[PDB]
Amino acid sequence: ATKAVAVLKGDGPVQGIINFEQKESNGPVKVWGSIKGLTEGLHGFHVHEEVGSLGNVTADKDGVADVSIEDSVISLSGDHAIIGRTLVVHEKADDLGKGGNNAGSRLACGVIGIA
Ligand SMILES: [Zn+2]
Ligand SMILES: [Zn+2]
Ligand SMILES: [Zn+2]
Ligand SMILES: [Zn+2]
Ligand SMILES: [Zn+2]
């Protein structure tokens, strides 16, 4: 299995660890972790280039967002591998093109490195 981690650090209190595992080179990439020091509600969860959308993560009342995701779009290998890209949790929600009418500041960010 191929594995990676992102350690999200921000300017303010936002921080957290994100794991990625992919059993087959074309199968889904499992994504998990928690992120702390967020405002309650949805927060844009992207993979930049330095965008790819992993949707949003959801923070609870005291700022903690547990992330458990399975994504068959992202991959850790191949021409569009996310290793060496930067994982980003944003200030506002990604409305995913359904805002009723982009995702605010980057609050905390982390490079997706092989583990
Ligand atoms: Zn392995
Ligand atoms: Zn973004
Ligand atoms: Zn909590
Ligand atoms: Zn290509
Ligand atoms: Zn929108």
**Which CATH number characterizes residue 75's domain?**
2.60.40.200
Sign of CA dihedral 103, 26, 83, 59: positive
Residues of the domain holding 109? 1-115
Closest CA to 103 of 32, 24, 41, 11: 41
Closest CA to 18 of 83, 96, 99, 100: 83
Query: How many CB atoms neighbour CB 100 within 10 A?
Result: 4
CA–centroid distance, 2 to ligand 1, in Å, is: 5
CA of 48, nearest ligand number = 2
76 Cβ contact partners less than 8 Å away, ≥ 6 residues apart: 2, 3, 4, 20, 22, 29, 82, 83, 112, 114
CA–centroid distance, 10 to ligand 2, in Å, is: 14
State the resolution, in angstroms. 2.2
- In the block, tokens 């982009």 appear at 102
CA–centroid distance, 78 to ligand 4, in Å, is: 9
The pair of three-digit structure tokens given for residue 91, joined into one six-digit string: 């200030």
CA of 59, nearest ligand number = 3
* One-letter amino acid for residue 12 of the chain: G
What residues pack around ion ligand 4 (CB closer than 5 A)?
79
3-state secondary structure of 91: coil
Looking at the structure of the chain, the number of domains it has is 1
The pair of three-digit structure tokens given for residue 106, joined into one six-digit string: 């980057």
CA of 80, nearest ligand number = 4
